[PDB]
């Protein structure tokens, strides 16, 4: 039935006079797929939506929200497109030169070089990494700290009742905000940014976002056993739990 | 079964004719093989084949083109004689059943001489004397009646005897007739032929004795327009009257081409089928050498399809049927670069129609008829018989019966097509090819495996396994039903030393090992399952192997990379369980290895997997 739904979109996109209904329905369809984490499904739909839809449509409470929801959804997708690239890279680290104990004088020199070339690649694989870390992070904070009212949260409050959508928007927050936090923690930990890891407890507990309400009690503790792990590595470095110099 | 009693009997006869050619034996007489069934039906059909045999029993030039034999004046002349000999003998049987009530009744008393029969035939059909007869009588009958019906029965000798007893009355007709009986091809010399024709035309154009009129222009082949309707009232009497009047190379003359065309063009089926008697028209076309017309015509009668197809086959196995080159033409047509007086039969279409009826539930019999198309191809080059077997297998789905079932023990019990050609590698791929194009992989594998095409068998077997690698193998599941066939293909491929290219082959045996890895993992045999994954050297367990294992993943079949997620988790969960039961350092070290590998590998669900892997390693410490 996947196709039935992703195909009803091209029918609504065809007629430009129904772009407001095409987007709204595109949202709904992408709300079902997100709850299943079908990101190639959600995105295959996301491209069918002409890149210039938003511009033309220009506002009923149903169109202000659907424009916001669409960008929220793009902010979410882009937060998985850049992580899978980053993650793919983290798993392609240059491998150490192989050792040939009891080497011939030939094998000694081939190895002096293979050992010197590797000490060039590992520097760039931290180079490319840093730039894929700086980018995946930004996206994770665009979703977690979504501007003007939080992620998947309507700004317009005068639409007509849509319990399906509304409760779909509360759910999407409870499936994906705990899951984006845990990823960002995994990104920060993987790159050794431990001080910042611990600063996820400010972001989450914050009264500005009230992200902690989107967490189950279990997920919290789990995030608290994740932070205590970053803390350790900060002690091993000689700093206090939170990364500040011990005077 | 879709075959009626008559059709079935013909099928068996065509199986024999095929069994003979398939084993190289003598080419038996097809016409005889078909008349063998005709006698099981009413004589309406028997008398047809009698005509078919006698019309095709002409001295031919073996290994000569069909169009050439049928255009040659040599052959065209013998057709007329074979027909006249049929119309004469056929009429002779009518004269017997007219005098005696049954052919058997005539035989027991003995067939009388054609003279005494004819005399005993005149008694009935003219009891009282007609006042317009001439030249007196002979032993109680008009001399001209005896001469006509004797010639009609085909016994010229019996007719000449009548002439010898009326020498004084008949005048100069004796020396003329005695020449006709002597000269071959039922023709007189131009000089004498001129003498009699002018005499008849002089003052006998309208004589009160119709029998006299008939004989004269049967001997002189004159007055072609006058159908002598006084004596030739039946249709066969007309055909016979005219075939004794046709000529070969300008006035008062008729040729076979004109006559054959004149008959069906001006007086088509409509004229000869008003009495709702179909064979009457068929005999008109067949006894005039228009075999294609008669075949198509008779092929449309839904009750006589069987008979018309076979009379086509006979004409086809005798190089007498004129096939239509193009397969896009109608059933009956005249080629543009041929004379208008001949027609052509789209033989390919003819059989294709007949077959569709009983091809669905009677495949064996269908093949016997498809064989006659072995000598023809299509626009794309395929062999028509081979293509017909492909289409018949795609539709009927009768693989074991027609293609030969390849059991799971390594045997190949031959199929019905094996009889006709020993090169069965292409069609098995053709049938396997489409079923592959229709997502029927489990079948395409069995079919490709039937032709020992391991390149395709293992390819498809890779696709059917990868989805089911991590699944739970349960009784009658789709895993068991696929794993058990894959293993039955692994043994038969090792015992027979068969293998595809190493890429396809390596992946195939690799999946089989993984399927064993999860079957042991889902059973709780942790120790045993850990040992298997270690052999495969697919997931690194010591930090030193990470570099090489990571490079290998890049060129491993995507059917493997797909299942990498479930492999890492099972392997981790394996170490995970063994931890709760120095060794602790060793598991801890291996735990780390899996993570770094997964970290450097971009793969399916790397997000959820890499996270779970790290959590399970933390609980260990």
Short mmCIF file of C-alpha atoms in Angstrom, two decimals, chain A residues 28-216:
data_model
loop_
_atom_site.label_atom_id
_atom_site.label_comp_id
_atom_site.label_asym_id
_atom_site.label_seq_id
_atom_site.Cartn_x
_atom_site.Cartn_y
_atom_site.Cartn_z
CA UNK A 28 0.28 13.35 6.50
CA UNK A 29 1.80 10.65 4.30
CA UNK A 30 5.28 11.53 5.55
CA UNK A 31 3.99 11.46 9.14
CA UNK A 32 3.04 7.78 8.77
CA UNK A 33 6.41 6.90 7.24
CA UNK A 34 8.40 8.80 9.89
CA UNK A 35 6.70 6.80 12.64
CA UNK A 36 8.10 3.76 10.82
CA UNK A 37 11.47 5.42 10.14
CA UNK A 38 11.10 4.91 6.39
CA UNK A 39 13.38 7.81 5.48
CA UNK A 40 13.84 6.82 1.83
CA UNK A 41 10.04 6.58 1.73
CA UNK A 42 9.57 9.98 3.35
CA UNK A 43 12.16 11.59 1.08
CA UNK A 44 10.95 10.02 -2.17
CA UNK A 45 7.74 11.83 -1.30
CA UNK A 46 9.69 14.92 -0.22
CA UNK A 47 11.17 15.41 -3.69
CA UNK A 48 7.82 15.01 -5.45
CA UNK A 49 6.92 18.25 -3.67
CA UNK A 50 8.26 20.86 -6.11
CA UNK A 51 11.12 22.81 -4.53
CA UNK A 52 9.19 26.05 -5.11
CA UNK A 53 5.88 24.97 -3.56
CA UNK A 54 6.22 27.20 -0.49
CA UNK A 55 6.84 30.37 -2.52
CA UNK A 56 3.75 30.03 -4.73
CA UNK A 57 1.19 29.03 -2.08
CA UNK A 58 1.45 32.45 -0.40
CA UNK A 59 -3.08 32.07 5.17
CA UNK A 60 -5.57 29.69 6.84
CA UNK A 61 -4.48 27.96 10.04
CA UNK A 62 -4.19 24.76 7.99
CA UNK A 63 -1.66 26.21 5.55
CA UNK A 64 0.53 28.03 8.07
CA UNK A 65 1.05 24.77 9.98
CA UNK A 66 1.58 22.55 6.95
CA UNK A 67 4.32 24.89 5.71
CA UNK A 68 5.95 24.72 9.15
CA UNK A 69 5.48 20.95 9.41
CA UNK A 70 7.08 20.45 5.99
CA UNK A 71 10.24 22.32 7.01
CA UNK A 72 10.29 20.53 10.36
CA UNK A 73 10.24 17.30 8.38
CA UNK A 74 13.07 18.54 6.15
CA UNK A 75 15.02 19.51 9.26
CA UNK A 76 14.52 15.96 10.49
CA UNK A 77 15.47 14.24 7.24
CA UNK A 78 18.59 16.39 6.80
CA UNK A 79 19.51 15.30 10.34
CA UNK A 80 19.67 11.70 9.11
CA UNK A 81 21.17 12.31 5.68
CA UNK A 82 24.24 13.92 7.27
CA UNK A 83 24.53 11.37 10.08
CA UNK A 84 24.56 8.35 7.80
CA UNK A 85 27.32 9.99 5.78
CA UNK A 86 29.20 10.86 8.98
CA UNK A 87 28.53 7.37 10.33
CA UNK A 88 29.61 5.69 7.10
CA UNK A 89 32.90 7.61 7.39
CA UNK A 90 33.54 6.77 11.05
CA UNK A 91 33.62 3.17 9.81
CA UNK A 92 36.25 3.68 7.11
CA UNK A 93 39.27 4.66 9.20
CA UNK A 94 42.64 4.06 7.52
CA UNK A 95 43.98 0.71 8.75
CA UNK A 96 47.40 0.48 10.41
CA UNK A 97 50.26 -0.79 8.25
CA UNK A 98 50.63 -4.57 8.49
CA UNK A 99 53.78 -5.72 10.29
CA UNK A 100 56.19 -8.26 8.82
CA UNK A 101 58.25 -9.38 11.83
CA UNK A 102 61.76 -10.47 10.81
CA UNK A 103 61.69 -8.24 7.70
CA UNK A 104 64.03 -8.34 4.74
CA UNK A 105 65.75 -5.03 3.97
CA UNK A 106 63.34 -4.68 1.05
CA UNK A 107 60.26 -5.17 3.24
CA UNK A 108 61.79 -2.75 5.74
CA UNK A 109 61.60 0.16 3.28
CA UNK A 110 58.24 -0.64 1.70
CA UNK A 111 57.05 -0.51 5.32
CA UNK A 112 58.81 2.76 6.21
CA UNK A 113 56.63 4.23 3.43
CA UNK A 114 53.33 2.44 4.08
CA UNK A 115 53.79 3.63 7.67
CA UNK A 116 54.43 7.21 6.50
CA UNK A 117 51.51 7.24 4.07
CA UNK A 118 49.11 5.98 6.75
CA UNK A 119 50.31 8.82 8.98
CA UNK A 120 48.90 11.13 6.32
CA UNK A 121 45.53 9.47 5.73
CA UNK A 122 44.62 9.23 9.42
CA UNK A 123 45.11 13.00 9.60
CA UNK A 124 42.62 13.63 6.79
CA UNK A 125 40.14 11.06 8.04
CA UNK A 126 40.09 13.34 11.09
CA UNK A 127 39.98 16.26 8.70
CA UNK A 128 36.97 15.02 6.73
CA UNK A 129 35.48 13.79 10.01
CA UNK A 130 35.66 17.18 11.73
CA UNK A 131 33.80 18.74 8.80
CA UNK A 132 31.17 15.97 8.81
CA UNK A 133 30.92 16.34 12.59
CA UNK A 134 30.55 20.12 12.43
CA UNK A 135 27.77 19.61 9.88
CA UNK A 136 25.81 16.71 11.37
CA UNK A 137 25.84 18.52 14.73
CA UNK A 138 24.35 21.74 13.36
CA UNK A 139 21.45 19.74 11.87
CA UNK A 140 20.80 17.91 15.14
CA UNK A 141 20.49 21.28 16.92
CA UNK A 142 18.19 22.66 14.22
CA UNK A 143 15.74 19.85 14.98
CA UNK A 144 16.22 19.68 18.76
CA UNK A 145 16.14 23.46 19.12
CA UNK A 146 13.68 24.07 16.29
CA UNK A 147 13.09 27.80 15.96
CA UNK A 148 9.79 29.40 17.04
CA UNK A 149 8.02 26.78 19.16
CA UNK A 150 9.88 23.48 19.00
CA UNK A 151 9.83 20.63 16.48
CA UNK A 152 6.52 19.34 15.13
CA UNK A 153 4.77 21.97 17.24
CA UNK A 154 2.16 24.16 15.56
CA UNK A 155 2.60 27.92 15.87
CA UNK A 156 -0.89 28.62 14.57
CA UNK A 157 -3.62 27.82 17.11
CA UNK A 158 -6.86 28.56 15.24
CA UNK A 159 -7.19 25.53 12.95
CA UNK A 160 -10.09 23.07 13.14
CA UNK A 161 -9.79 19.86 15.17
CA UNK A 162 -7.51 17.19 13.72
CA UNK A 163 -6.83 14.68 16.48
CA UNK A 164 -5.12 12.27 14.07
CA UNK A 165 -2.54 14.84 13.00
CA UNK A 166 -2.14 16.49 16.42
CA UNK A 167 -1.51 13.19 18.20
CA UNK A 168 0.72 12.18 15.30
CA UNK A 169 2.75 15.30 16.06
CA UNK A 170 3.07 14.50 19.76
CA UNK A 171 4.12 10.94 18.98
CA UNK A 172 6.68 11.91 16.33
CA UNK A 173 8.26 14.04 19.03
CA UNK A 174 8.45 11.12 21.50
CA UNK A 175 9.94 8.70 18.96
CA UNK A 176 12.43 11.02 17.32
CA UNK A 177 13.59 13.55 19.90
CA UNK A 178 14.82 10.87 22.31
CA UNK A 179 16.41 9.22 19.27
CA UNK A 180 18.11 12.37 17.93
CA UNK A 181 19.49 13.23 21.37
CA UNK A 182 21.04 9.77 21.78
CA UNK A 183 22.62 10.12 18.33
CA UNK A 184 24.08 13.55 19.01
CA UNK A 185 25.45 12.11 22.24
CA UNK A 186 26.99 9.33 20.17
CA UNK A 187 28.47 11.87 17.75
CA UNK A 188 29.86 14.05 20.55
CA UNK A 189 31.29 11.04 22.35
CA UNK A 190 32.75 9.52 19.19
CA UNK A 191 34.65 12.73 18.44
CA UNK A 192 35.74 13.24 22.05
CA UNK A 193 33.67 16.37 22.67
CA UNK A 194 32.89 15.31 26.25
CA UNK A 195 32.31 18.73 27.82
CA UNK A 196 29.52 19.32 25.30
CA UNK A 197 28.03 15.86 25.81
CA UNK A 198 27.26 16.82 29.39
CA UNK A 199 25.66 20.02 28.08
CA UNK A 200 22.86 17.91 26.64
CA UNK A 201 21.45 17.97 30.16
CA UNK A 202 20.99 21.72 29.85
CA UNK A 203 19.41 21.51 26.40
CA UNK A 204 16.99 18.77 27.48
CA UNK A 205 15.95 19.96 30.94
CA UNK A 206 15.68 23.52 29.58
CA UNK A 207 12.40 25.28 30.34
CA UNK A 208 12.76 27.03 26.98
CA UNK A 209 12.11 23.81 25.08
CA UNK A 210 10.79 21.42 27.73
CA UNK A 211 12.41 18.55 25.84
CA UNK A 212 12.37 16.42 29.00
CA UNK A 213 8.61 15.93 28.71
CA UNK A 214 9.13 14.07 25.44
CA UNK A 215 11.21 11.53 27.37
CA UNK A 216 10.00 8.42 29.16
#
